[PDB]
Design a protein around this ligand. Structure first.
Ligand SMILES: N[C@@H](CCC(=O)N[C@@H](CSSC[C@H](NC(=O)CC[C@H](N)C(=O)O)C(=O)NCC(=O)O)C(=O)NCC(=O)O)C(=O)O
Lengths: 590, 590
């Protein structure tokens, strides 16, 4: 429909590149070489016919011949050289177009990928995020196959059949056009019908094979239980049954393919025999001459070869079309959150976080935020404490605008968040994840990831302040090693130290931490507490802690219960008033 | 070498199956149809030559072929009928042989699986499961492809070229044999060389695409940290770099394939043109060569077609040979533990387990079994307690003879383990694993797995006694549902109850348990303890328990420390003597 037209137009735009001339030149060369190859391929049997007729008459009063070629040996040499020229033209065409095909594939894949990171995370959380690369790869392969086929096989064969039909309609009677048209029409319709029939058999084969492999894996993995009793009496029988089903499916597929091939051969053989016998009648009558039989045979045989893979190319074209449709469906996906055009840049004159009756529900069945109204002063450290249902994990998401607030407003530095560019707030906010992930690269790059275009002395002094430099010096190579998976293993405390180094390199105005739960010694806990205190020395900070013992360090404490505020203030006055926070101590510290 | 001869002989033995004639007849039919198809294919151009010669002479010498065909139209009809007959013979041959190929592949796969499922447990630990299934599938595909190719393409093309070179070098000059020999020799050597060079290029190509896909996965899965800062920055550039590498490799591969194709085309074109020119010289000289130029052209062209996939078939044959070698390497693997020829079935008269200074070490650098010599009376309950390093998890393996004792003696009912039939002890021992795995089948099958060929009422009463009938009555469907993966989840207590019901159905003479650690309420704990007591009411038992609160239920208790015995006897005398068991209670029960 309209979507298909849009996809075709987009593909044409990504194939033309009007800005540069090299690709236009290459496309022109491709079409030129295609036409030249087809013309030479048609002209070869004419040379063979001329040679045969001349030899037959010897044992030809023409202007062109007897001057360019002195003897029939020259004509046969020209036959060979014309075949070679046709092959060389096909060579050049396929290489020249393949280059541009690869270029456009690369451009399309990069565009889709870069758009994929632009979309919000509610999209990513919906699915498994591992099949997206599968779709990308499948669509790239589909683009490659469809372009290569549509430019190398479908068009050249149409040109070939057009030339054959035209050159037989002329120079002969009109019956040859009827013969070739009917033959190719019946051939095409038969091939399409049998392919549509065989697809079901192939799909039946694949599922049975996959089931047999899955049963084999399940049987092998559970070795000890199978060896505990009933040793091998039962499992081999069921594996044999699955193998028998696979065998039956394969046999049926092979039989159907054989039938298809036999039908195609019959159709083309009867077409060729009818053409040659009619030519023989013509020669016997006296209107024609020997050699036209040879020319007709050779020309029909030349036409035969490209039409031998019609079923395979049709099936693969259908599959590639479906895959291309899916990949382009990944695009043109809207974003729930967007930035207004009239937005104002964010100014940082001293962070003043203010919340005013924020309501939110990730799923409408359950509401997890109920009118939170906490206010963070300038240069003060606040803490959020509660249970799992207190909804503590979403506060940083809201402050970073991962999920837009259903109702209510936020004053950051006396400014609303909705009508400012998200880039400024994303650049002015630093975060410490619960479980930081280390990239499959060197340590220095991971430390530098906090802020690109940074000098080496900066990251060196940041690591020194984080007190990780001494730990780095113990590795086999200084400030360089494969870390993460498929490499050196780094401790969780060291991992969160790396995360602290990143957020210190970024040097933001507001920091948010989460204090991930881990089994840590007292000395390391004190060291990381000192590091965090140094990080939040002169910045507005909002902390959430799983372990309350670390939460007394903040100036002010707010307790959240079931998505609603209960009490606020320092811990000592919470003892004095014996509020909910006191009961939180009662079952925590005892 | 010798292994290659062995695998070829084994494959031939599987392919023949002299016992049943239904496969000998099929093989004979396959060879007959192959020979007939090749004969007809070579004979096709001769009819065209005869028709063309007769037609040219018409516009007379009698070769005594006027009786079969009255007019040249009959010969031209015979041309097509011979082509159709050749195609029919080919497809009959391919179907008839594919049947036997699909039989032998299944037989080989089942045999290899059954043998692989019989090796020792040490081999299964060493190799990563799933790799075995991958090797099995790859080798099966290798068998299928190598048999199909070696019977459908390599042999028929050799016959075709031999018979073409036999039709030539007779009825013509001797130079035709030289041409059709050296041309095909040069063709083969050139194709092999360029095929090796291209396969090196392709092996270089694949890795770049794999790396690009892996990087896409890694970049996408770690979305939140990328969105925290420097979003859509360095990642897009790196992905561009990887796609650029892949594009360069693909372009190089395409160019290499193009060059190979052009070389093959030019070689065959020059061979064909030389043969044509020599035949033209012959016909002009006035020799017996008259109008048979078309015969030579058609015969060489027929020979050309099968030789257009030599590189692909060679590369795939090499790969399939490697995979076949891998599969047949999985076979002929010795088992560490074997049963002696003088072994006898074990007779039970009341289990008496006796240990005599058993020494064992899984890896020689660390010894975990050091001379344990406990003796279990008839119809008594013995408990083993200790720490993680005590080695409590291997006594059941030794008594079940998963491994073998390095130096020691095991006396069961006054009989030695080593020189008795192992099937008897496998059948006379029942075990309760820590984490039993429920098969992805119906619940009734999983319960019946304990003892095959068992009546449904026995299974029903066994489930009822295990106090599971009430629980299993509460699923939406009774006695039939999908359980385990891809099905409804089953509780850990329910899973343990299923295992207990299974081992109750087995009804052995000696039972061993492990008391897997799991959170559980008091009522269900008492219920499963009562069930275990009922199971071990009148049988010798070897209990090991993570929770020591359940250990005094047994009659006698033996404590193990660092793979050595410390004290033995009931708990009251352990308290009286104030042995290690007192410390176990003090730092365990407090
Ligand atoms: N160019 C090399 C030959 C190597 C080559 O080109 N190999 C082909 C294999 S096409 S193999 C494709 C084949 N097609 C068919 O079988 C068509 C059957 C149809 N129904 C009919 O009418 O006959 C098929 O897959 N059938 C499945 C089935 O049997 O069910 C290729 O694509 N190479 C790519 C590369 O080298 O990079 C040379 O000349 O030396």
């Amino acid at each position: 429909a309209m979507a298909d037209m849009k996809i075709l137009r987009t593909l044409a735009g990504y194939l033309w590149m009007r800005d540069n001339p090299e690709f236009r030149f290459r496309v022109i060369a491709a079409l030129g070489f295609l036409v030249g190859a087809k013309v030479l391929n048609v002209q070869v049997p004419f040379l063979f016919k001329l040679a045969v007729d001349w030899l037959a008459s010897a044992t030809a009063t023409n202007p062109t011949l007897l001057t360019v070629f002195a003897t029939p040996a020259a004509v046969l040499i020209g036959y060979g050289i014309a075949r070679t020229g046709s092959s060389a033209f096909n060579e050049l065409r396929t290489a020249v177009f393949s280059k541009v095909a690869l270029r456009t594939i690369r451009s399309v894949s990069r565009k889709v990928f870069s758009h994929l990171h632009d979309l919000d995370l509610r999209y990513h959380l919906s699915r498994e995020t591992g099949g997206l690369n599968r779709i990308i790869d499948r669509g790239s392969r589909a683009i490659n196959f469809i372009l290569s086929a549509m430019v190398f096989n479908v068009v050249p064969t149409i040109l070939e059949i057009s030339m054959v039909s035209g050159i037989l309609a002329y120079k002969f009677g009109a019956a040859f056009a009827w013969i070739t048209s009917l033959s190719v029409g019946s051939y095409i319709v038969f091939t399409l019908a049998v392919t549509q029939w065989r697809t079901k058999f192939r799909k039946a084969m694949n599922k049975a094979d996959n089931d047999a492999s899955t049963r084999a894996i399940d049987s092998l993995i559970n070795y000890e239980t199978v060896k505990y009793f009933n040793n091998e009496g039962y499992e081999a029988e069921k594996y044999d049954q699955f193998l028998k089903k696979y065998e039956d499916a394969a046999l049926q597929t092979q039989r159907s393919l054989a039938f298809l091939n036999f039908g195609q051969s019959i159709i083309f053989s009867t077409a060729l025999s009818t053409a040659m016998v009619l030519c023989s009648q013509g020669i016997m009558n006296g209107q024609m001459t020997v050699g036209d039989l040879v020319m007709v045979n050779g020309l029909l045989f030349q036409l035969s070869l490209p039409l031998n893979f019609l079923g395979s190319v049709y099936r693969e074209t259908i599959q590639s079309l479906v895959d291309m449709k899916s990949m382009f469906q990944l695009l043109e996906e809207k974003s729930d959150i967007t930035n207004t055009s009239d937005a104002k840049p964010l100014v940082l004159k001293g962070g003043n976080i203010e919340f005013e009756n924020v309501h939110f529900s990730y799923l409408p069945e359950r509401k997890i935020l109920d009118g939170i109204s906490f206010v963070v002063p300038a240069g003060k450290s606040v803490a959020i404490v509660g249970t799992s249902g207190s909804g503590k994990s979403t506060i940083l998401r809201m402050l970073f605008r991962f999920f837009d607030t259903d109702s209510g407003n936020i004053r950051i530095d006396g400014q609303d968040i909705k009508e400012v560019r998200l880039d400024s707030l994303r650049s002015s906010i630093g975060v410490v994840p619960q479980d930081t992930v280390l990239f499959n690269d060197t340590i220095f790059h991971n430390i530098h990831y906090g802020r690109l275009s940074a000098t080496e002395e900066e990251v060196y002094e940041a690591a020194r302040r984080a007190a990780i430099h001494e730990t780095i010096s113990n590795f086999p190579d200084k400030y360089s090693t494969i870390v993460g998976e498929r490499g050196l293993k780094l401790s969780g405390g060291e991992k969160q130290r790396v995360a602290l180094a990143r957020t210190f390199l970024k040097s933001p105005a507001i920091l948010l931490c989460d204090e991930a739960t881990s089994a840590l010694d007292s000395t390391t806990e004190a060291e990381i507490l000192n590091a965090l205190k140094a990080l939040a020395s002169n910045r507005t900070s909002i902390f959430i802690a799983h372990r309350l013992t670390t939460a007394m360090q903040c100036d002010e404490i707010v307790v959240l219960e079931n998505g609603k505020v209960v009490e606020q203030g320092p811990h000592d006055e919470l003892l004095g008033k014996s509020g909910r926070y006191a009961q939180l101590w009662t079952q925590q510290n005892s």
